[PDB]
Amino acid sequence: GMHTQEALFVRLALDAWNTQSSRTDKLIQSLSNEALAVETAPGRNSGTYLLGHLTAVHDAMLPLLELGDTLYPQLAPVFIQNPDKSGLEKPEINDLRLYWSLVQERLANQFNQLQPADWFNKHAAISREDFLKEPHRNKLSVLINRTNHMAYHLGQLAYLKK
């Protein structure tokens, strides 16, 4: 019944995250460093930047979902707070590939241990008071939102496959 239904909608949301994650991971693995460094389209973000961006955004989900601290806080100034052509030094690409992999794996670990119910609790960026009015502003809503963020950028990364 109701406990089972809650488990089914967590499955749906997690299956979409996992599908986008698989596609993103496989795409990144398929590209050489030289191919990743190219702009996704003229004047637009490089694959390297999008990799770092996705990594930083996913890492930030850890504290937002009360699943632990970020692993790599120094990525956020480079890949969230500043644009690609900022002139700020980036990590080497193979280090970014590893950070991506370790953030994704930590999230998978943590997600796989959460009970369906925990997903319906508030995320860290909303007050208890505001969550009462809008209980849809929960941890699952973050998962859903970031899954679409990833899909959006995956459409751009797709243009690096020549």
Interacting residues toward its own copies by CB under 8 A: 1-2, 5-6, 8-9, 11-13, 15-16, 19-20, 40-42, 44, 120, 135-136, 138, 140-141, 144-145, 147-149, 151-156, 158-159
Nearest to 160 by CA among 63, 92, 93: 93
Nearer to Cl ion, 50 or 160 (CB): 160
62 binds Cl ion (CB under 5 A): no
Residue in 7, 35, 125, 132 binding Cl ion, rule: CB under 5 A = 35
In the chain, what's the furthest Cα-to-Cα distance?
A: 55
Going by the DSSP 8-state scheme, the letter that residue 40 receives in this structure is S
Name the minimum Å distance from CB 28 to its own copies.
16
Nearer to its own copies, 70 or 84 (CB): 84
Residue in 16, 27, 38, 64 binding Cl ion, rule: CB under 5 A = 38
> How far out from the chain centre does Cα 8 lie?
22
Which of Cl ion, its own copies, none has residue 103 at its interface (CB below 5 to 8 Å by kind)?
none
d(C-alpha 32, C-alpha 29), whole Å: 8
85 touches 40 (CB < 8 A): no
Question: What residues contact residue 151 under an 8 Å CB cut-off, 6+ apart?
Answer: 20
